């Protein structure tokens, strides 16, 4: 799901694609503390 059509403001099929604790929790530090 990388990309998806969608109509944009004018024209069409522009096909576009698709904090700091959001950052650190996939931290592997986080996993092994």
Same mark, same amino acid.
């Given at each position: 799901?990388?990309?998806?059509? +969608? ?11 698709v904090a700091c ?9 986080? +996993?092994?503390f």
């Amino acid at each position: 799901t990388t990309q998806m059509f +969608h109509e944009d403001a004018a024209g069409g099929w522009q096909l576009v694609a698709v904090a700091c604790l959001q950052k650190m929790m996939r931290s592997s530090v986080f +996993h092994m503390f």
